[PDB]
Amino acid sequence: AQNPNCNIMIFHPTKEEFNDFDKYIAYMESQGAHRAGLAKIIPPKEWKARETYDNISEILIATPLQQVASGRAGVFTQYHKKKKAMTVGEYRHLANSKKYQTPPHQNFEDLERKYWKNRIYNSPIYGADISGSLFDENTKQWNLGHLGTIQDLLEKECGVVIEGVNTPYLYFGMWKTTFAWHTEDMDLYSINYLHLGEPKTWYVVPPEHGQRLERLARELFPGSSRGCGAFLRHKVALISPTVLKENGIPFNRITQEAGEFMVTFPYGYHAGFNHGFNCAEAINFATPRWIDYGKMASQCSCGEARVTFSMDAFVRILQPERYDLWKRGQD
Ligand SMILES: O=C(O)CNC(=O)C(=O)O
Ligand SMILES: [Mg+2]
Ligand code: NI
Ligand SMILES: [Zn+2]
Secondary structure, three states: OOOOOOOOEEEOOOOOOOOOHHHHHHHHHHOOHHHHOEEEEOOOOOOOOOOOOOOOOOOEEOOOEEEEEEEEOOEEEEEEEEOOOEEHHHHHHHHOOOOOOOOOOOOHHHHHHHHHHHHHHOOOEEEEEEEOOOOOOOOOOOOOOOOOOHHHHHHHHHOOOOOOOOOOEEEEEOOOOEEEEEOOHHHOEEEEEEEEEOOEEEEEOOHHHHHHHHHHHHHHOHHHHHHOOOHHHHOOEEEOHHHHHHOOOOOEEEEEOOOOEEEEOOOOOEEEEEOOOEEEEEEEEOOHHHHHHHHHOOOOOOOOOOOOOOHHHHHHHHOHHHHHHHHHHHO
């Protein structure tokens, strides 16, 4: 078995190997990359996502979210408070202000310590889930706006044509902006490109050990657990690496820098934080190996997790028994 310790693997494809996305994902998995739940892909040196980032300031962040924490430093939840619209230019100015900017630090490890020590005492503002793309339409390789769609993958594997579309999303982050512990909708893959700015640190649990994370989470967030059998779908719970180590949860960590891709694999729980002002683009995708994860994915039916138009069809076809109860939560 390849990668039996489930380490995060880093890949350095050539420009030739960067031509066929599907085939490269399949190559990574042949080397055991999926076992970690997350891989890093450094693009060939000849590759670029677009020519410059000089003209992005007029993108609108219609609903910036202030991330308010409750709990203790190592075990907390966050809620998202809606703020007034601002432009990327305005957001970047806010991210760089004395109130929100990254503090002095020695190295990524010192900054990670400061994050976990201090995150709960601040409320950073996140421009998340903004439909759109920063890839130049003439970038042909690993252009997240030109990937094959999940609906076409389901049609190719299973023979059923379904409604729905699949498009990318932009994330504008600042120091301490946080992504809570989650797997993707319907335990899909995700791919994330860090277009510009400061780094993003990631934590991940190997898919084969996901249930151990879930069990710890039910212990650490007992009222949430009673309210919903899949409450990590709410994307509100954080658990520090210290707390995971104390409870014997296997995980790994890695820092993504501007110009690098990350791929999360089906049922790979992940969480993390941004180091300072940055802009990432991400999209879900599927392969033939996803299908069986899609069939088994947990669902939130308490009604909190409230998800896309396109997830309907996935649940309808892959999880017909759940469909009924899940759509009652969605309506
Ligand atoms: O970049 C972020 O805030 C979070 N992204 C993801 O969880 C992802 O790409 O799967
Ligand atoms: Mg602009
Ligand atoms: Ni994710
Ligand atoms: Zn729920």
